[PDB]
Amino acid sequence: GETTDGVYRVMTRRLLGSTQVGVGVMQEGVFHTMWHVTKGAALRSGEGRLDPYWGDVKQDLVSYCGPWKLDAAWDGLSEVQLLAVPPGERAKNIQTLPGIFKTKDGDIGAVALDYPAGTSGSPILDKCGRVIGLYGNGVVIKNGSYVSAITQGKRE
């Protein structure tokens, strides 16, 4: 169906009404989203079907119709934009300076913005409009607020 580059809502009709369970990026004919959004299930785009191609639970990422295409990285210094697509609400760009998730396997960028769980998969961008990662997998800090990692895949 629609294979135009851009940001898309991931909807489901299994529950009451049409519920938004996540968001994704269409780039170079590949749909990129978070694994916890689809659980690796097939997606519909009008009359067309999108089949999973690559997926990993630990990374929490999945790609449809082809290999993962997003490979831009956070420079570790500049502000970024979360292009938040919330359920029932219009896509909005929120500018923020990321924090740092310090891990035993290296440091990763982190965006401290609170959005409903169905906003998972919304892209995080650099000043060039390039997707540096997806929003939706992180931690809940002391006051109930969410801090998501800047999650990026590997371009093979």
Partner: protein, 39 residues
């Protein structure tokens, strides 16, 4: 069956709402892809 719907273009927008802090957090990622805070 899940389905997709276009929500917009992927572009940087000048004069966007600037909000959110930058915390440095000690974290751990498990085999199930779940992050947890290390204390």
């Amino acid at each position: 069956d899940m389905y997709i719907e276009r929500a917009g273009d992927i572009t940087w927008e000048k004069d966007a709402e600037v909000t959110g802090n930058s915390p440095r957090l000690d974290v751990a990622l498990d085999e199930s892809g779940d992050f947890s805070l290390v204390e």
